Symmetry: C2
Subunit: 84 residues, 2 copies
């Protein structure tokens, strides 16, 4: 019952506050997984971990300016361009 | 044989060139699907369309500065925060 979960975080980093929110979101997601691009994370989590992480993420983002999408994927992925 | 495909584009928009590359990538992906966040796209494509789109995307990005990931998902997704 472990799941691959993809988290995509849309935040304006032109501001120092949006910069800090990304750093906080990255730190939260990296407890459960990997930062694969600047604001994209791949976490392998069970249901309890996903509930905990979603709750934490909800407290970290600006729900009026940012958005976060969570994709639930026993799971193909291609990478083109620079390695991060 | 239609597939849901998620495309995540990592580009520095602080520069006008990176700004333009995002606009070009968005226009390419929007021929096959939807811009769901600033640099995230959901496209429903067959194999031929995916080959064409991947080839086009390869010509549009800066392969030394940007990165693009392509996730192949008969396919759950949650959205938190602002609606784009």
């Amino acid at each position: 019952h472990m799941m691959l979960v993809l988290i995509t975080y849309d935040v304006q980093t032109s501001s120092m506050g949006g910069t800090k929110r990304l750093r906080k979101v990255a730190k939260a997601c990296q407890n459960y997984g990997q930062r694969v691009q600047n604001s994209v994370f791949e976490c392998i989590v069970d249901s309890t971990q996903l509930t905990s992480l979603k709750l934490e993420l909800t407290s970290l983002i600006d729900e009026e300016k940012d958005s976060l999408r969570i994709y639930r994927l026993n799971y193909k992925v291609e990478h083109i361009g620079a390695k991060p």
